[PDB]
Structures are given as C-alpha cells and as structure tokens.
C-alpha cells in the first residue's frame, strides 16, 4: 500500500468509514472518563446530586475532545482505551477514531 | 365553545398542538421523578454508581407514562406537577399533556 | 425442517403455542427482576413501604418488556434467565417467549 496501514477496526459503527482529504491527529494519551474514586471517596443523598455529577463528569471528556477538534481534524487515533461515551460523541461529531494501537506504528504514521 | 375549555398552556413546546380524533386520559395523580431522599439516605463512591442510579430512576417515571399510554391516549392531562424530564419523553412520544389544572374542571371534562 | 429449530421448551404454559405470521424479537440481555441488594442495603419499618417497593420494582421489568413490545413482536426469545413474574406478564400480553438458548442458534436464527 502506498501509505501507512493500521491493523485495528474503527471504534464505533456510527463513524465516517471513508474521509476525503483527511487531517490526522496523532493523539497519544488517556481518552476515557476519569475514574473519580481515587480523586475522591464521597457519599450521596438525593438524585438531584447524581445528575450534575455524571453530567459534568461526561462533559469533562468532551472537553479533551473539543480541545483536540480545536485543530479541526477529520480523523483522530491514539494508543490507549477510548471511552464508549466519548465514542457516541465523536460519532455525533462525524470523526473517525481508532482504539489502542501499537506506538510502533504511530511513529511510522507520524 | 361547544365543548370543555382548559385554561392552562401546554407543558412542552415539542408537543402536538392540534390532534385529530383525540382520546383524552384524565390522570389524577403524581407524575414527577420520585424524590428518593425520604426512601433512602445513602453515600456514593465512583461515577459508575451514578449512571445506573439516575438512569433507572428516570426509567421509573417513564414506567408510569408507558403504563398510561398502555391505553393509547392522544392526550393526557392531570392536576399535579409534571416532571420536566417526563415532558421530553411525552414530547418524543407525540403526546399532548397539561400541568396542574383545578380538579374543578377535570370533572366537567370527565 | 425448512427453517430454524430451537431446542428449548416455552417459558410459560399460558402463552400462545402457535402464532400466525410472527415477528420474532431476538433479545440478547438480562430480563429478570433486578436484584436490588447490590444497589442498596436498607432497613424497613411498616408494610406501607413494602408495597410501593415490590410494586415499582415489578414495574421496572415490565418496562423493559413494554419497551421491547414497543416494536410489536409476536414472539421474543433471549439467551438469559427470564423472571417468573415477567412470564405472567408476557403470558397476559399474549407473547411467546423462550428462556436461556445457546447464542449459537440465535445467530443462525438471526
């Protein structure tokens, strides 16, 4: 093939499986909801607290995503586990993303 | 007017503001997310717990809604406060619902 | 046989043992009352609390059932254990359901 070839299926079926003139974004770092247990141990009372908890926590990952799309990339691949909720987000955005992928090829693709 | 007239604006803008051949459902009872604090006081750790908490709790109200639509009514009005999340549900279902309304007229409409 | 054949007796005797023009619903997932112990550990006082507890908890499973019948299927089979209370519900609804069944055949039937 006259270009790099990545052996790993796309992350979500709701993503563009063919982009014209792409702008790859080699993102090497954690891209999944932050386990918040280590940061905090806490109690809970009413459901009012629940919502604003999982909502902003979900918006935390969308941040990293927008901060990356801030460059406007058609495709984005990384070498770590990508959150399943973050997939539905990238899916709704129209991005093509790939899960874990040996750093071994990111460079050759770099 | 050759029929009953209810003085109270519809609950959500995303609802049918005109139904042909309607099948009214006079539902007199509580139709909002159940405050769960009285039932329980509890702590919380990780976000994994959050989701399944607000999710099933949201599905609890949708239950009452489906149990009512179980008769298949085009419109449903009650005399109590209707949850705002339950509105988005009825809105997506294509139902016409009305908030609090003096029992005084429910009967005349009955 | 000129079609798929499932080796597993029906779930409840009160169900249609012969449907004309069926609309199969291959549901692969948990379909039984949710053990609520893991979610919560709690105390109890009076019987007033009991009712509203087992009632809504029973209505929780009926939700999944209605959400599936939302497509209007004559028959529904899965590969997990189906609650016995959920059977009386499907039985009263006039649905034909089957208990655990090797995924091996769900696909061939898919």
Q: Do the beta carbons of residue C97 and residue C12 sit within 8 Å?
A: yes
Please choose, from the candidates B19, B36, B20, B35, the residue with its C-alpha nearest in 3D space to the C-alpha of residue B90: B19
**Sign of the torsion formed by the C-alpha atoms of B78, B81, B85 and B87:** positive
Q: Would you call B18 helix, strand, or coil by DSSP?
A: coil
Strand locations in B1-110, DSSP E? 24-26, 42-44, 75-77, 96-98
Sign of CA dihedral A21, A110, A6, A71: negative
Partner B contacted by A38 (CB < 8 A): no
CA dihedral for C59, C61, C65, C70, sign (positive or negative): positive
Torsion of Cα atoms, B20 then B21 then B26 then B31, to 10°: -40
Contacts of A50 (CB under 8 A, 6+ apart): A44, B44, B50, B53, B54, B57
Chain A residues near residue B47 by CB distance under 8 angstroms: 33, 35-36, 53-54, 57
For this entry, resolution in Å reads 3.7
Experimental method: X-ray
CATH of residue B33? 3.50.7.10
- Residues 48-67 in B contacting A (C-alpha not used; CB under 8 Å): 49-51, 53-54, 57
Instruction: Inform me whether the C-beta atom of residue B88 falls under 8 Å from chain A C-beta atoms.
Output: no
Residue of B nearest to A50 (CA): B50
C-beta of residue C93 within 8 angstroms of C-beta of residue C16: no
Task: Please indicate if any CB of chain A lies within 8 Å of the CB of B41.
Answer: yes
Q: How far is B21 from chain A (nearest CA, A)?
A: 38
Residues of B in Cβ contact (< 8 Å) with C65: none
Contact yes or no for C100/C80 (Cβ under 8 A): yes
Read off the DSSP letter of residue B61: H
Contacts of B25 (CB under 8 A, 6+ apart): B68, B71, B73, B75, B76, B77
Residue ranges of the alpha helices (H) in B14-83?
A: 47-69
Rounded to whole angstroms, the Cα distance separating B110 from C82 reads 40
CB under 8 Å to A19, separation ≥6 — which residues? A74, A75, A96
CB contact under 8 A, B43 and A46: no
Entry field: residues in chain A: 110
Do A45 and B41 make contact, defined as CB atoms within 8 angstroms? Answer: yes
Burial class (CB in 10 A: 0-12, 13-18, 19+), C44: exposed
Judge residue A41's burial from the number of C-beta atoms within 10 Å of its C-beta, 0-12 exposed, 13-18 middle, 19 or more buried: exposed
Contact in structure between B26 and B105 (CB atoms under 8 Å): no
Cα angle, residue B88 at apex, residues B84 and B89 outer, rounded to 5°: 110
Q: Which residues pair with C24 in a beta bridge?
A: C75
Residues 6+ apart with CB under 8 A from B46: A35, A36, A37
Length, in residues, of chain C: 110
How far is the alpha carbon of C18 from chain B, nearest alpha carbon, in Å? 25
Nearest beta carbon to residue C59 from set B40, B52, B63: B63
Residue with tokens 């609890």: B60
Enter the tokens of residue B95.
């139902």
Residue A31 carries which DSSP code? Answer: B
Q: A72 — contact with chain B (CB < 8 Å)?
A: no
Q: How far apart are CA B89 and CA B33, in angstroms?
A: 12
Q: How far apart are CA C12 and CA B110, in angstroms?
A: 40
State the Cα angle at B33 between A58 and A62, rounded to 5°: 10
Return the SS3 of B10.
strand
- Kindly report the three-state secondary structure assignment for every residue of A40-75: CCEEECCHHHHHHHHHHHHHHHHHHHHHHHCCCCCE
In angstroms, rounded to a whole number, what is the distance separating the alpha carbons of residues A74 and C16? 53
Bridge partners of residue C75, in order along the sequence: C24, C96
Q: Return the residue of B nearest to C44 by Cα.
A: B39
3-state SS record for chain C: CCCCCCCCCECCCCCCCCCCCCCEEECCCCECCCCCCCCCCCCCCCHHHHHHHHHHHHHHHHHHHHHHHCCCCCEEECCCCECCHHHHHHHHHCCEEECCCCHHHHHHHC
Helix (H) or strand (E) holding B41: none
Adjacent-strand bridge partners of C76: C25, C97
> What is the least distance, in Å, from the CA of B85 to any CA of chain A?
12
CA of B93: which chain C residue's CA is closest? C70
**CA–CA gap between residue C60 and residue B108 (Å, rounded):** 34
Domain of residue C88 covers: 2-110
Of how many residues is chain B composed?
A: 110
**Proportion of chain B in helix, strand, coil states, percent, rounded to 5:** 35, 15, 50
| Chain centroid, CA B92 distance in Å | 12
CA atoms lying within 13 Å on the CB side of residue C28: 9
CA distance A6 to A109: 9
A42-44 and B42-44 as β-strands: parallel, antiparallel, unpaired?
antiparallel
Q: Look at B63 and C67 and tell me if their CB atoms are within 8 Å.
A: no
Could you give the number of structural domains in chain C? 1
* B54 in Cβ contact with B76 (< 8 Å): no
Beta-sheet strand order (sheet of A75-77): A24-26, A75-77, A96-98
B43 vs A contacts (CB less than 8 Å):
42-44
């Amino acid at each position: 093939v006259y270009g790099i070839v990545v052996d790993k299926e796309v992350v979500h079926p709701g993503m563009p499986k063919r982009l014209e003139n792409a702008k790859i974004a080699l993102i090497d770092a954690s891209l999944e909801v932050e386990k918040p247990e280590l940061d905090a141990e806490i109690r809970i009372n009413d459901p009012t607290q629940m919502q604003k908890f999982l909502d902003e926590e979900e918006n935390l990952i969308k941040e990293k995503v927008d901060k990356i799309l801030a460059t406007g990339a058609n495709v984005i691949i990384c070498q770590k586990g990508i959150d399943e909720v973050a997939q539905s987000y990238l899916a709704k955005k129209g991005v093509l993303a790939v899960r874990r992928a040996k750093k071994s090829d990111l460079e050759k693709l770099a």
